[PDB]
Scaffold this active site. Structure first.
Site, PDB file in Angstrom:
ATOM      1  N   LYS A   1       0.816  -1.213   0.000  1.00 34.93           N
ATOM      2  CA  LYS A   1       0.000   0.000   0.000  1.00 34.93           C
ATOM      3  C   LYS A   1       0.856   1.273   0.000  1.00 34.93           C
ATOM      4  O   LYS A   1       0.340   2.388  -0.131  1.00 34.93           O
ATOM      5  CB  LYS A   1      -0.937  -0.014   1.201  1.00 34.93           C
ATOM      6  CG  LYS A   1      -1.952  -1.147   1.122  1.00 34.93           C
ATOM      7  CD  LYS A   1      -2.796  -1.255   2.373  1.00 34.93           C
ATOM      8  CE  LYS A   1      -2.002  -1.808   3.547  1.00 34.93           C
ATOM      9  NZ  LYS A   1      -2.906  -2.213   4.668  1.00 34.93           N
TER      10      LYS A   1
ATOM     11  N   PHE B   1      14.050  -4.826   2.121  1.00 29.36           N
ATOM     12  CA  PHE B   1      15.274  -5.482   2.646  1.00 29.36           C
ATOM     13  C   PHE B   1      14.929  -6.266   3.920  1.00 29.36           C
ATOM     14  O   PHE B   1      15.223  -7.479   4.055  1.00 29.36           O
ATOM     15  CB  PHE B   1      16.349  -4.390   2.860  1.00 29.36           C
ATOM     16  CG  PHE B   1      17.395  -4.703   3.870  1.00 29.36           C
ATOM     17  CD1 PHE B   1      18.209  -5.829   3.747  1.00 29.36           C
ATOM     18  CD2 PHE B   1      17.655  -3.800   4.910  1.00 29.36           C
ATOM     19  CE1 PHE B   1      19.236  -6.066   4.672  1.00 29.36           C
ATOM     20  CE2 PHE B   1      18.663  -4.022   5.833  1.00 29.36           C
ATOM     21  CZ  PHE B   1      19.460  -5.144   5.724  1.00 29.36           C
TER      22      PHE B   1
ATOM     23  N   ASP C   1      13.329 -11.244   6.890  1.00 36.36           N
ATOM     24  CA  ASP C   1      12.395 -11.632   7.929  1.00 36.36           C
ATOM     25  C   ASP C   1      11.614 -12.910   7.527  1.00 36.36           C
ATOM     26  O   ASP C   1      11.441 -13.806   8.349  1.00 36.36           O
ATOM     27  CB  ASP C   1      11.442 -10.463   8.240  1.00 36.36           C
ATOM     28  CG  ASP C   1      10.412 -10.814   9.274  1.00 36.36           C
ATOM     29  OD1 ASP C   1      10.751 -10.782  10.474  1.00 36.36           O
ATOM     30  OD2 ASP C   1       9.271 -11.151   8.881  1.00 36.36           O
TER      31      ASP C   1
ATOM     32  N   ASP D   1      11.582 -16.223   9.746  1.00 39.73           N
ATOM     33  CA  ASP D   1      10.279 -16.581  10.337  1.00 39.73           C
ATOM     34  C   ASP D   1       9.645 -17.795   9.656  1.00 39.73           C
ATOM     35  O   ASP D   1       8.564 -18.230  10.049  1.00 39.73           O
ATOM     36  CB  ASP D   1       9.319 -15.383  10.287  1.00 39.73           C
ATOM     37  CG  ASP D   1       9.744 -14.238  11.219  1.00 39.73           C
ATOM     38  OD1 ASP D   1      10.636 -14.454  12.070  1.00 39.73           O
ATOM     39  OD2 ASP D   1       9.157 -13.121  11.120  1.00 39.73           O
TER      40      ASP D   1
ATOM     41  N   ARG E   1       3.726 -13.539   1.029  1.00 36.52           N
ATOM     42  CA  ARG E   1       3.832 -12.121   1.337  1.00 36.52           C
ATOM     43  C   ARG E   1       3.216 -11.370   0.152  1.00 36.52           C
ATOM     44  O   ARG E   1       3.502 -11.679  -1.013  1.00 36.52           O
ATOM     45  CB  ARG E   1       5.324 -11.771   1.530  1.00 36.52           C
ATOM     46  CG  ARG E   1       5.757 -10.311   1.402  1.00 36.52           C
ATOM     47  CD  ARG E   1       5.768  -9.559   2.695  1.00 36.52           C
ATOM     48  NE  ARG E   1       6.475 -10.203   3.808  1.00 36.52           N
ATOM     49  CZ  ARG E   1       6.251  -9.859   5.078  1.00 36.52           C
ATOM     50  NH1 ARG E   1       5.374  -8.893   5.363  1.00 36.52           N
ATOM     51  NH2 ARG E   1       6.896 -10.451   6.067  1.00 36.52           N
TER      52      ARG E   1
ATOM     53  N   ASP F   1      13.457 -10.004  19.019  1.00 34.42           N
ATOM     54  CA  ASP F   1      12.371 -10.828  18.504  1.00 34.42           C
ATOM     55  C   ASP F   1      12.819 -12.302  18.430  1.00 34.42           C
ATOM     56  O   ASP F   1      12.146 -13.197  18.930  1.00 34.42           O
ATOM     57  CB  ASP F   1      11.936 -10.279  17.140  1.00 34.42           C
ATOM     58  CG  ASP F   1      10.868 -11.129  16.465  1.00 34.42           C
ATOM     59  OD1 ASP F   1      11.248 -12.113  15.791  1.00 34.42           O
ATOM     60  OD2 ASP F   1       9.667 -10.808  16.583  1.00 34.42           O
TER      61      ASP F   1
ATOM     62  N   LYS G   1      11.996  -3.101  16.697  1.00 36.10           N
ATOM     63  CA  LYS G   1      11.873  -3.850  15.442  1.00 36.10           C
ATOM     64  C   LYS G   1      10.954  -3.163  14.460  1.00 36.10           C
ATOM     65  O   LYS G   1      11.077  -3.387  13.267  1.00 36.10           O
ATOM     66  CB  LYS G   1      11.471  -5.332  15.643  1.00 36.10           C
ATOM     67  CG  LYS G   1       9.991  -5.604  15.883  1.00 36.10           C
ATOM     68  CD  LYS G   1       9.661  -7.082  15.681  1.00 36.10           C
ATOM     69  CE  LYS G   1       8.206  -7.389  16.048  1.00 36.10           C
ATOM     70  NZ  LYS G   1       7.785  -8.751  15.653  1.00 36.10           N
TER      71      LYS G   1
ATOM     72  N   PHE H   1       0.769  -0.148  15.727  1.00 40.86           N
ATOM     73  CA  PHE H   1       0.837  -0.810  14.433  1.00 40.86           C
ATOM     74  C   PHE H   1       1.304  -2.269  14.554  1.00 40.86           C
ATOM     75  O   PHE H   1       0.779  -3.143  13.874  1.00 40.86           O
ATOM     76  CB  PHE H   1       1.755  -0.055  13.487  1.00 40.86           C
ATOM     77  CG  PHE H   1       1.764  -0.608  12.101  1.00 40.86           C
ATOM     78  CD1 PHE H   1       0.793  -0.226  11.184  1.00 40.86           C
ATOM     79  CD2 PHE H   1       2.732  -1.528  11.707  1.00 40.86           C
ATOM     80  CE1 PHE H   1       0.797  -0.738   9.895  1.00 40.86           C
ATOM     81  CE2 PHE H   1       2.724  -2.043  10.415  1.00 40.86           C
ATOM     82  CZ  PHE H   1       1.757  -1.641   9.515  1.00 40.86           C
TER      83      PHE H   1
ATOM     84  N   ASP I   1      -0.555  -5.736  13.831  1.00 38.40           N
ATOM     85  CA  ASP I   1       0.061  -6.766  12.999  1.00 38.40           C
ATOM     86  C   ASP I   1      -0.002  -8.136  13.667  1.00 38.40           C
ATOM     87  O   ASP I   1      -0.252  -9.153  13.010  1.00 38.40           O
ATOM     88  CB  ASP I   1       1.531  -6.406  12.698  1.00 38.40           C
ATOM     89  CG  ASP I   1       2.198  -7.420  11.782  1.00 38.40           C
ATOM     90  OD1 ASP I   1       1.846  -7.439  10.580  1.00 38.40           O
ATOM     91  OD2 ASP I   1       3.049  -8.183  12.282  1.00 38.40           O
ATOM     92  N   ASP I   2       0.221  -8.175  14.982  1.00 36.22           N
ATOM     93  CA  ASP I   2       0.167  -9.420  15.722  1.00 36.22           C
ATOM     94  C   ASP I   2      -1.274  -9.963  15.743  1.00 36.22           C
ATOM     95  O   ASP I   2      -1.499 -11.152  15.594  1.00 36.22           O
ATOM     96  CB  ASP I   2       0.651  -9.217  17.145  1.00 36.22           C
ATOM     97  CG  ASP I   2       2.139  -8.918  17.232  1.00 36.22           C
ATOM     98  OD1 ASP I   2       2.857  -8.967  16.198  1.00 36.22           O
ATOM     99  OD2 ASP I   2       2.585  -8.671  18.364  1.00 36.22           O
TER     100      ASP I   2
HETATM  101  O1  LIG Z   1       5.098  -8.762   8.040  1.00 37.79           O
HETATM  102  P1  LIG Z   1       5.383  -9.630   9.343  1.00 37.79           P
HETATM  103  O2  LIG Z   1       6.224 -10.931   8.980  1.00 37.79           O
HETATM  104  O3  LIG Z   1       4.118 -10.040  10.125  1.00 37.79           O
HETATM  105  C1  LIG Z   1       6.409  -8.551  10.497  1.00 37.79           C
HETATM  106  O4  LIG Z   1       5.575  -7.442  10.942  1.00 37.79           O
HETATM  107  C2  LIG Z   1       7.602  -8.059   9.666  1.00 37.79           C
HETATM  108  C3  LIG Z   1       8.598  -7.239  10.334  1.00 37.79           C
HETATM  109  C4  LIG Z   1       9.928  -7.355   9.943  1.00 37.79           C
HETATM  110  C5  LIG Z   1      10.941  -6.588  10.510  1.00 37.79           C
HETATM  111  C6  LIG Z   1      10.639  -5.643  11.477  1.00 37.79           C
HETATM  112  N1  LIG Z   1       9.326  -5.493  11.860  1.00 37.79           N
HETATM  113  C7  LIG Z   1       8.312  -6.278  11.306  1.00 37.79           C
HETATM  114  P2  LIG Z   1       6.941  -9.560  11.957  1.00 37.79           P
HETATM  115  O5  LIG Z   1       7.640  -8.605  13.026  1.00 37.79           O
HETATM  116  O6  LIG Z   1       7.790 -10.725  11.469  1.00 37.79           O
HETATM  117  O7  LIG Z   1       5.580 -10.087  12.593  1.00 37.79           O
HETATM  118 MG   LIG Z   2       7.666 -12.026   9.888  1.00 36.19          MG
HETATM  119 MG   LIG Z   3       9.687 -11.368  12.208  1.00 34.96          MG
HETATM  120 MG   LIG Z   4       3.628 -10.270  11.997  1.00 36.24          MG
END
Ligand SMILES: O=P(O)(O)C(O)(Cc1cccnc1)P(=O)(O)O
Ligand SMILES: [Mg+2]
Ligand SMILES: [Mg+2]
Ligand SMILES: [Mg+2]
Ligand SMILES: O=P(O)(O)C(O)(Cc1cccnc1)P(=O)(O)O
Ligand SMILES: [Mg+2]
Ligand SMILES: [Mg+2]
Ligand SMILES: [Mg+2]
Lengths: 343, 343
Positions: free
Chosen positions: B50, B91, B96, B100, B105, B167, B193, B232, B236-237
C-alpha cells in the site's frame, strides 16, 4: 616486517571497539540481551584471522601521513577504520558460509552451523554491517574525510554484492552447464566479489585519511590493486581443493557447489572430450567419490603446476604495474602488501 | 484523501528508479546478468504493497515545505526518498520471511520459497539495502540534508536489527518458556523492530528535507510516532491470527514460531493455571491441530474484544499526544497518518 610491527597495537584495540559498541546498553538496559548477542557475534566472527585487510589500512596510514600528524588520536582513528574493514569482511563471510553451505571457517564450526543459531545468523551478519557505520560516526564524524569513508564503504559493499550475485548465478545448484565457465566470466566475478573490498578498499581508506582524494591517484592505485585482488581469489580457489584445512581453517566446497573456480576454468581449456565428459558427470555433486574424481582429473592435467607458473607470471606483472602506477605514492605501500600475499 | 492524491505520481516514479539503477549496466556490460537479477528482485519485492511508509515522506514533505520550494526537482527527490523507505522495508521483509519460515507475502510466494532462489535471497536482500544509498547519492548528494539522511537510514537500520535480535532471542525454536513473554519485554521488542523504521523514519526524512533538524522538534515527533508504531505492531500481531489472508496477503506463523506476540502476552495475563497448561503444551509447534487449540483459547478469553478496546484507548492516547507535541509542525501531518493506520 612492517605488518608484524603494527599488529599488536591493532589487535589490542579490538577491546576498545567491543567496549564502545556495547556502551549502547548503558542508557538503554531494555536492549541488554541484544547487546550481549552482538558481543558474542563480534568475538566469534571478527577474531581469529590474520587481519591482513585491517592491518593494511594502518600500515598504509603510517607510510602516507607525515609522522608529525600521527598523534595518539589519529592512530586511534586508523586502528578503528582498520577494524571496520575487518567487520565488513566478517559481514560478507557469515552470509557467504550460509549461501555456500560451508562447514568450518578459521578452524571452528561456521557461525550458522552452531547449535541454536541457524538462520538467525542472517540478522547477525547485518548487525556486523551496521557496526561499521556506528564506529565511523563515533570516531570520525568531525574529520574532513568522514563522508568520503562512508561513501567508500557503501560503494565497496554494493560492488561486492554484485560480485556475489555473479558468483551465485554462474553456479546454480543441480544444474551443471560447463559452457558458462569461461575465463572472461571468471575475471568479472572475482573483480567484483573480491578485488574491490579486499585490496582497493583498505588502501583507499588510508588515502582519504591522508587527504589524497584525487581521482587520478585513486585510478592508479586501482590498476595495481584490482590485479592483486584477482590473484588473491585465484589462490583462494586453488587452496579450496589443494590447501591443507588445518592451515586454511576451512573445508572446501567449490566442486560440490558447482562454482566457477579458476581450477575448473583452466581444466576446461586443457581437457580432451573424454576428460570433459568425466568433469560433466562428477562436477557439482555432494558425493565424496565424485569430488575425488574431479580432483584426480585436476592432478592428471597438472593444474598445481599451472598455478605455480601463474603465480610467478602474476608477481612479475604486478611489479611492473607498481613501477608504472605507484607514483606519487611510495612504492613501499604496494610492495609490502605484495610480499604478504605472494610469499 | 491526501495519500490517494499523491499515490499515482509516487507509484509512477518507480519506473524512473528502476531505470537509473539499471543504467549501471551501460558502462559495465560484464555485470549485465547481475543487473537483470537486481531488476527482478526490485519488481518482485518492492511492488505490491500500500506504500504507506513511502507515501508518508511525500505527504509530509508537501505539508512542511513552502509551496514556492516544491519545484519539479524537489518533488523528484521527495519521491526518491519515499522509495528508499520502501526499499528499506523490502530489505527487512525478504530476510524476515526466511527467519520466520513464512510462506506468502503480498499475496504471492515469499521470494526465498521461489524455485531456484532459496538462500541466495540473503544476498538479494543486501542488494536492496545497497540500492538505498545509490539512490541517495544520485539524487541528493548536492543537498544540505544529504549526510543527515544517510545517518538517519543507517541508524534506523541498526535500531531495527537490534529489534529483530530481541524478537528472535525471545522466540527460540523448540524451547517454550512462557515466563519470558511479559508486557515489558513486548514493548521493547516492538519499539526497536518496528516503530523507528515504520513511523519515525519517514516523517524524520521529510523534516530534514524541509530544514527542520532541531533536536527538540525530532524528540517531540518521536513521542507521537513511537506510540503509533507500537499500536501498528499490535495490530500486525492480531492480524497474524485473526486477519483474512486474502486481505493481509500473508499466512500467519507467530504461534508456530514461538513468538512473543501481543496475543500471547494478553493471554498470559488472563489465563487460569489450567489454561496456562493448554498454552504451554500447544504453543511453538507446527502441528495444525495444536495451533487450532491456541486460537480456540484466545477466542475463549475474548482477545478479539480486548484488541478492539485497546484500539480505541490507543487512538485517544495518540490524539492527546498530538495535541501536546505536534507544534510547531502542522497537526495535519500526524492526523493524516493516524487516519491511515487506525481506520
Ligand atoms: O510482516 P510480518 O512478517 O508479520 C512482520 O511485521 C515483519 C517485520 C519485519 C521486521 C521488522 N518489523 C516487522 P513480523 O515482526 O515478522 O511479525
Ligand atoms: Mg515475519
Ligand atoms: Mg519477524
Ligand atoms: Mg507479523
Ligand atoms: O572464504 P571463501 O568461502 O573461500 C570466499 O573467498 C569468501 C568470499 C566471500 C565474499 C566475497 N569474496 C570471497 P568464496 O568467494 O566463497 O570462495
Ligand atoms: Mg565461500
Ligand atoms: Mg562464496
Ligand atoms: Mg573460496
Amino acid at each position: 616486517d612492517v605488518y608484524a610491527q603494527e599488529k599488536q597495537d591493532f589487535v589490542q584495540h579490538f577491546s576498545q571497539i567491543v567496549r564502545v559498541l556495547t556502551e549502547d546498553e548503558m542508557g538503554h538496559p531494555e536492549i541488554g540481551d541484544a547487546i550481549a548477542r552482538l558481543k558474542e557475534v563480534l568475538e566469534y566472527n571478527a577474531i581469529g584471522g590474520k587481519y591482513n585487510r585491517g592491518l593494511t589500512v594502518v600500515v598504509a596510514f603510517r607510510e602516507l601521513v607525515e609522522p608529525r600528524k600521527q598523534d595518539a588520536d589519529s592512530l586511534q582513528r586508523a586502528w578503528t577504520v582498520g577494524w571496520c574493514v575487518e567487520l565488513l569482511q566478517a559481514f560478507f563471510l557469515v552470509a557467504d558460509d550460509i549461501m555456500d553451505s560451508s562447514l568450518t571457517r578459521r578452524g571452528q564450526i561456521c557461525w550458522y552451523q552452531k547449535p541454536g543459531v541457524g538462520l538467525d545468523a542472517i540478522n547477525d551478519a547485518n548487525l556486523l554491517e551496521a557496526c561499521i557505520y556506528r564506529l565511523l560516526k563515533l570516531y570520525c564524524r568531525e574529520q574532513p574525510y568522514y563522508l568520503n569513508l562512508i561513501e567508500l564503504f557503501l560503494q565497496s559493499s554494493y560492488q561486492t554484492e554484485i560480485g556475489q550475485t555473479l558468483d551465485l548465478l554462474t553456479a546454480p545448484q543441480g544444474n551443471v552447464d560447463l559452457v558458462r565457465f569461461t575465463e572472461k566470466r571468471y575475471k568479472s566475478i572475482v573483480k567484483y566479489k573480491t578485488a574491490f573490498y579486499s585490496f582497493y578498499l583498505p588502501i583507499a581508506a588510508a588515502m582519504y585519511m591522508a587527504g589524497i582524494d584525487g581521482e587520478k591517484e585513486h585510478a592508479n592505485a586501482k590498476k595495481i590493486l584490482l590485479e592483486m585482488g584477482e590473484f588473491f581469489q585465484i589462490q583462494d580457489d586453488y587452496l579450496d581443493l589443494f590447501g591443507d584445512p588445518s592451515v586454511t581453517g576451512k573445508i572446501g566446497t567449490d566442486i560440490q557447489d558447482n562454482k566457477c573456480s579458476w581450477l575448473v576454468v583452466q581444466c576446461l581449456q586443457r581437457a580432451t572430450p573424454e576428460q570433459y565428459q568425466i568433469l560433466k558427470e562428477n562436477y557439482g555433486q555432494k558425493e565424496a567419490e565424485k569430488v575425488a574424481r574431479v580432483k584426480a582429473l585436476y592432478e592428471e592435467l597438472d593444474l598445481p603446476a599451472v598455478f605455480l607458473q601463474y603465480e610467478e607470471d602474476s608477481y612479475s606483472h604486478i611489479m611492473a604495474l607498481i613501477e608504472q602506477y605507484a607514483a606519487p605514492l611510495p612504492p613501499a605501500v604496494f610492495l609490502g602488501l605484495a610480499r604478504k600475499i605472494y610469499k
